[PDB]
RNA sequence: AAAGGUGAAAAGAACCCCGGGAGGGGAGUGAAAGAGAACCUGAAACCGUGGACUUACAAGCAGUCAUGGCACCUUAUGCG
RNA sequence: GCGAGAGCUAACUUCCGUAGCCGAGAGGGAAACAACCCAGACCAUCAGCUAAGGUCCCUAAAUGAUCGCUCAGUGGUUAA
RNA sequence: GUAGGGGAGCGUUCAGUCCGCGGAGAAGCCAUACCGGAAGGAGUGGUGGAGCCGACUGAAGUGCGGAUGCCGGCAUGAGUAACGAUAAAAGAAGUGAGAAUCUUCUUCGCCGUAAGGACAAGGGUUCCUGGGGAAGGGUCGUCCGCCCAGGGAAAGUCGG
């Protein structure tokens, strides 16, 4: 078979620098457009990241800094975003698929908070 | 080159092969906001709504 | 009647609802793929499908559709709410031969096909 | 003085090609394959002129022995029963008689039996 | 190496419609645009659209002969 | 095929003599098959008689007549 | 009926001669169910837009399915194999008729005895600026080492 559990597009360091870069991006900008797949892949990673940061303990922060190597952003998610997302069970992230593209013909989508 | 074909193929055969190449027509919907036709489970590229309006017109 | 000469100066010979894009830098075959979906159906529908078909022939095919409509409406004074793609088709144009270097010294020739996308609109007529 | 081959080869070729009607494939569209078909075509045409006669004869017989059998005789017995009597010498067309007019052919059979035993 | 050809003469398309363009449709010039400038004729391979008659249990050098069905009647309502 | 040599009285073998056919020979028969059997195609025909071969069915033509054989599927691969 | 010999003719170009046809229209091309014993010939229609049948006679660069023939065009393989080092990239913003591919920003990654820098040889405007988007660019392209115009190169002592 192949009944595993994740996606891959490149190697091992890649899917990482990706998920990180994109998580940072979204956290910073509140909404981004990207390929529907990359979006799908980002959803749970970032949801989980809110839940970590959603703790307040310096630990939780120092955890979050492993992924978000941008200070302004760590502070944002930590002190602003997490707090706000305090009463809702989990995960406020949603995906809206725009439409096909011209360059390569790939369906695009928007992920946002 | 080992992968060579014996005879040239007939118009007939060479077309029967292509009898599976017909693109499907995009099933389009009517947008309940700006009466424009859009793609199901997507966002109306015209007015920009999808239950209230998301993208910039 | 008269003969073969007079008829020539008495009639100029018009093409009701006819548009052609000649020399389109695409291979006929693909464009056939795109056109096939419009073969004999509402011009409205036509415009709508071309707007979503993920192929790139879509564009020029569209542009020509519109130019036809334009003609039927301004040069032929037809009723656009009854317009439809009576007939449409793609002919091969001249070809762009290019010399593409292969291995070991041998060369080939890439063939860059072109197209004369034509489309002709018409009132349904019940 | 020079003499191109102009217009000659075209016409020859077109004559050939126009022969090709129900001709499948390039048999009907590429000269060489056309002409080439036309050879073996010759063969069939000429032999079939001779063969069609065999065919038909066979047909007529196949009907005649049936007729014969409808009463209680056969083809051997029946024709033979027209040889013994210089009377009946139809032979040709007889099939049409057994196919259209049954009564007539019955009379012929009865005649054949009467001119035998 | 290959490569010729608008028209009698440029009057070789002001203006309008689609399009970034290319391209095209009108209008006008001209005998002619069925000569429109990658313009005398425009064969064949080759690609395609429309129509008629047909094809999804048979082994096919792709014909030939015979018969039946369907369709069309400008050398041609009965010969094809 | 006949008459010889050579060869194991082998070879779709080879080398001579002689007859016929193929080569340049269509047609019928032998399932198919150059040679074998019958027969040498001037052309046309919804005419008739025969040859070699056959006459249950798949192709045309007596599941014909009388007197025998063979229990074998011999016919439808061979000998001491 | 093969090699081969013999006989009678068809067709094409040029030439002489004769009868002629052509703007209400030649040749050529396209269709066709007619004629002749064959090569072939003719009527009608369509296209075409200038020249050309028939008869007789003379002369040939005179008849093509083949030669792994020559030239040219177009097919099949098929929307197939590939798109040229496995140093991946992501988001925002801008421009635009049109951006995955151009511009800017913030990150990410890779070379760093180089994948940095400066010369000789060699290539000759490829530099700079402003335009352009046919073709080149292995995709797009608004960009480019591509196209167009304009500018730029300064020696008593560094090379000769
Ligand atoms: K124009
Ligand atoms: Mg690593
Ligand atoms: Mg006029
Ligand atoms: Mg006979
Ligand atoms: Mg021998
Ligand atoms: Mg010989
Ligand atoms: Mg036989
Ligand atoms: Mg007999
Ligand atoms: Mg006998
Ligand atoms: Mg029988
Ligand atoms: Mg046995
Ligand atoms: Mg003139
Ligand atoms: Mg010669
Ligand atoms: Mg050849
Ligand atoms: Mg070979
Ligand atoms: Mg060639
Ligand atoms: Mg595919
Ligand atoms: Mg394949
Ligand atoms: Mg594959
Ligand atoms: Mg590939
Ligand atoms: Mg490779
Ligand atoms: Mg690569
Ligand atoms: Mg890249
Ligand atoms: Mg090192
Ligand atoms: Mg210099
Ligand atoms: Mg530069
Ligand atoms: Mg370009
Ligand atoms: Mg390109
Ligand atoms: Mg100086
Ligand atoms: Na991975
Ligand atoms: Na068809
Ligand atoms: Na002989
Ligand atoms: Na045998
Ligand atoms: Na003719």
- How many Å apart are CA C35 and CA C29, to the nearest integer? 10
Cα distance between residue B24 and residue C68, in whole Å: 24
Contact present, C89 and C118 (Cβ < 8 Å): yes
| Shortest CA gap B42–chain A (Å) | 5
Residue B44, annotated as binding a ligand: yes
Domain extents in chain C: 1-126
Q: How far is the CA of A85 from the C1' of F10 (A)?
A: 105
Give the total number of structural domains in chain D. Answer: 1
Q: Tokens at residue C51, please?
A: 């707007």
| CA D66 – CA D95 distance, rounded (Å) | 10
* Segments making up each domain of chain A, as ranges: 1-113
Q: What is the DSSP string of C77-117?
A: ---GGGEEEEEEEEEE---EEEEEE-STT-EEEEEE--EEE
Touch between B and A (at least 3 CB pairs under 8 Å):
yes
How far apart, in whole angstroms, are the C-alpha atoms of residue A15 and residue A10?
Answer: 7
What's the gap between Cα D40 and its chain centre? 20
Q: How far apart are CA C26 and CA C60, in angstroms?
A: 10
Q: Where are the beta strands (DSSP E) in chain B?
A: 28-30, 37-39
| Cβ-based burial of A77 (10 A; exposed 0-12, middle 13-18, buried ≥19) | buried
Pairing of strands B37-39, C18-24: unpaired
CATH architecture assigned to A1-113 = Alpha-Beta Complex (3.90)
Based on its alpha-carbon atoms, the radius of gyration of chain A, rounded to whole angstroms, reads 15
- Name the method of structure determination: X-ray
Domain range for D34 is 1-117
Q: Which residues contact residue A99 at a Cβ distance below 8 angstroms, ignoring those fewer than 6 apart?
A: A107, A108, B39, B42, B43, B45, C52
Closest CA to A38 of A91, A113, A97: A97
- Give the DSSP letter of residue B49: B
The closest of C115, C110, C118 to C93, measured between CA atoms, is C115
Q: Tell me the CA–centroid distance for residue A103 and ligand 26, in Å.
A: 26
User: Are the Cβ atoms of A105 and C54 closer than 8 angstroms?
Assistant: yes
Resolution in units of Å? 3.2
Nearest ligand to the CA atom of A19: 30
Backbone angles phi, psi at C71, to 5 degrees: -60, -55
Q: Report how far residue B52's alpha carbon sits from residue A54's, in angstroms, rounded to the nearest whole number.
A: 30
Task: List all residues 6 or more positions away from D68 whose beta carbon is below 8 Å from its beta carbon.
Answer: D74, D75, D77, D78, D109
Which architecture, in CATH terms, is C1-126?
A: Alpha-Beta Complex (3.90)
Report how far Cα D112 is from the mean position of its chain's Cα atoms: 28
- CB of B53 within 8 Å of a chain A CB? The answer is no
For the segment 9-68 of chain D, residues whose CB is within 7 A of strand G: 9-15, 18, 31-33, 35-36, 39
- Using the structure block, give the residue that is written with the tokens 């890439």: C110
User: Which nucleotides on chain E have any atom < 7 A from a protein Cβ?
Assistant: 16-19, 21-27, 30-34, 38, 43-50, 61-66
């Amino acid at each position: 078979h192949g009944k595993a559990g994740r996606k891959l597009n490149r190697n091992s360091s890649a899917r990482v620098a990706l998920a990180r870069a994109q998580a940072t991006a979204l956290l910073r900008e509140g909404r981004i457009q990207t390929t529907l797949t990359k979006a799908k892949e980002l959803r749970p990673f970032v949801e989980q990241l809110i839940t970590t940061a959603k703790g307040g303990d310096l630990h939780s922060r120092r955890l979050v800094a492993q992924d978000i190597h941008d200070k302004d952003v760590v502070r944002k998610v930590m002190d602003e975003v997490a707090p706000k997302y305090a009463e809702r069970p989990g995960g406020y992230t949603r995906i809206l698929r725009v439409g096909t593209r011209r360059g390569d013909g790939v369906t695009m989508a928007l992920i946002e908070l | 080159k080992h992968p060579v074909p014996k005879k040239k193929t007939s118009k007939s055969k060479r077309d029967m092969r292509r009898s599976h190449h017909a693109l499907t027509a995009p099933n389009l919907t009517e947008c309940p906001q700006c009466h424009g036709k859009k793609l199901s489970h997507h966002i109306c590229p015209n007015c920009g709504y999808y239950d209230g309006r998301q993208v910039l017109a | 009647f008269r003969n073969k000469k007079q008829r020539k100066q008495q009639v100029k010979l018009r093409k009701p609802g006819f548009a052609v894009a000649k020399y389109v830098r695409m291979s006929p075959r693909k464009v056939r793929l795109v056109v096939d979906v419009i073969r004999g159906k509402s011009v409205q529908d036509a415009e709508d499908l071309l707007r979503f078909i993920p192929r790139s022939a879509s564009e020029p095919v569209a542009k020509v559709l519109n130019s036809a409509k334009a003609n039927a409406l301004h040069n032929d004074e037809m009723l656009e709410d009854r317009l439809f793609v009576k007939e449409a088709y793609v002919d091969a144009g001249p070809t762009l031969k290019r010399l593409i270097p292969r291995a070991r010294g041998s060369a080939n020739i890439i063939k860059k096909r072109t197209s004369h996308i034509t489309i002709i609109v018409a009132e349904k007529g019940n | 003085p020079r003499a191109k081959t102009g217009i000659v080869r075209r016409r020859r070729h077109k004559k050939v090609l126009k022969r090709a009607k129900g001709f499948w494939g390039s048999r009907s569209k590429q000269y060489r394959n056309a002409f080439q078909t036309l050879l073996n075509a010759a063969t069939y045409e000429y032999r079939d002129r001779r063969n069609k006669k065999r065919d038909f004869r066979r047909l007529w017989i196949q009907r005649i022995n049936a007729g014969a059998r409808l009463h209680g005789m056969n083809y051997s017995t029946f024709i033979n029963g027209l040889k013994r009597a210089n009377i009946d010498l139809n032979r040709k067309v007889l099939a049409d008689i057994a196919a259209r007019e049954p009564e007539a052919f019955k009379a012929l059979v009865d005649a054949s039996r009467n001119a035998r035993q």
